[PDB]
């Protein structure tokens, strides 16, 4: 028989059609996604110790530690460490989903842009993005999202957009700084920039 | 091309190749310490990687990943061979290295914010178009 350890469910005699229909099912697919999300979370946050093999300190060692001093230990409260470890986990997650995409913004008018940066017209993954879309069987989600799709064709020439600068662009966005170190910045800029 | 103002995307490529391929993890510190001094547009991101990657240090010997042994003892007064209770000594060490990173960030932030505010805010077109195009 066939049993899906992700879904924890038996089914009747597996035929390649029935099994292949199950493996692309929606309920199955969210449960499988959850499974590997949890296992990757575990192999990150497994907090377990190496064994500590403690050696008897020599006397010649133990004099020089008597000189130095005790050094103070900082320890947070329970509620404090609850908040701060939430914050630190949130910082690692948003620093992991951060990607640098400036060079796609800078080349936005160039003559061969659609063929290299649209990524649907590329010659290596152009067919694959076409195959990747979905069966798209529920079109009610497509009619619920009432945007225009606004695809870039491959057939663009440089005649369109002759003068890029005629109000069409906006300035480059300023470089982001660390919010914990935001008082580090010089207080006043050098020149008087209006607006 | 490594000193380009927008060259952060190159250094992301180099760091993800290092972090997948290399087993030793000294090469990641040695590349990221160089990246820390370049006045890139996205300079903060690599400061945040260095701060997280300092914050996850779990004992004293890992600090020889950061710099050398003699520079730690002479400049910052950290002994890696300190045998004793090593908890608060490590917290003191991480506080000292986070301070020396703060001063290096402060230098690079001045560089980057100066270059952006005078010059790079003003350039809009970064690519060749055609022999018939005009520039403002």
């Amino acid at each position: 028989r066939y049993y899906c350890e992700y879904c924890h469910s038996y089914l009747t005699h597996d035929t390649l059609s029935v099994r292949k229909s199950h493996l692309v099912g929606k309920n199955h697919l969210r449960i499988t996604a959850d499974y590997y999300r949890n296992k990757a979370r575990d192999i990150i946050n497994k907090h377990n110790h190496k064994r500590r093999h403690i050696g008897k300190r020599g006397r010649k060692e133990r004099e020089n530690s008597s000189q130095n001093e005790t050094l103070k230990v900082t320890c947070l409260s329970n509620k404090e460490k609850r908040h701060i470890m939430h914050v630190k986990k949130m910082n690692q997650k948003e620093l992991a989903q951060t990607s640098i995409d400036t060079l796609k913004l800078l080349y936005d008018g160039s003559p061969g842009y659609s063929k290299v940066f649209v990524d649907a017209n590329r010659f290596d993954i152009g067919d694959l993005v076409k195959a990747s879309k979905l069966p798209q069987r529920a079109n009610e989600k497509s009619a619920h999202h009432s945007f225009k799709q606004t695809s870039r064709s491959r057939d663009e020439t440089c005649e369109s957009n002759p003068f890029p600068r005629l109000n069409n662009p906006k300035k480059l966005e300023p470089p982001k700084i660390l919010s914990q170190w935001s008082n580090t910045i010089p207080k006043t800029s050098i020149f008087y920039s209006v607006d | 091309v490594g000193l380009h103002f927008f060259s952060g995307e190159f250094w992301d490529l180099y760091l993800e190749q290092i972090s997948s391929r290399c087993t030793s993890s000294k090469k990641y510190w040695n590349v990221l310490r160089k990246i820390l001094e370049i006045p890139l547009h996205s300079f903060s991101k690599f400061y945040a990687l260095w701060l997280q990657r300092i914050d996850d240090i779990m004992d004293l010997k890992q600090l020889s990943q950061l710099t050398s042994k003699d520079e730690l003892l002479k400049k910052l007064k950290i002994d890696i061979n300190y045998s004793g209770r090593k908890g608060p000594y490590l917290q003191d060490a991480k506080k000292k290295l986070k301070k020396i990173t703060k001063e290096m960030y402060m230098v690079v932030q001045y560089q980057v914010l100066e270059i952006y505010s005078i010059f790079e805010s003003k350039i809009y077109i970064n690519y060749y178009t055609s022999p018939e195009t005009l520039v403002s």
Partner: peptide, 24 residues
């Protein structure tokens, strides 16, 4: 909130030295 924020700075009060447009 997020660990990356845009920088913000004070204006330098517009004399003839801090005017970027000054040509004389």
């Amino acid at each position: 909130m997020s660990q990356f924020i845009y920088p913000v700075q004070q204006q330098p009060s517009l004399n003839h030295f801090t005017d970027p447009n000054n040509t004389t």
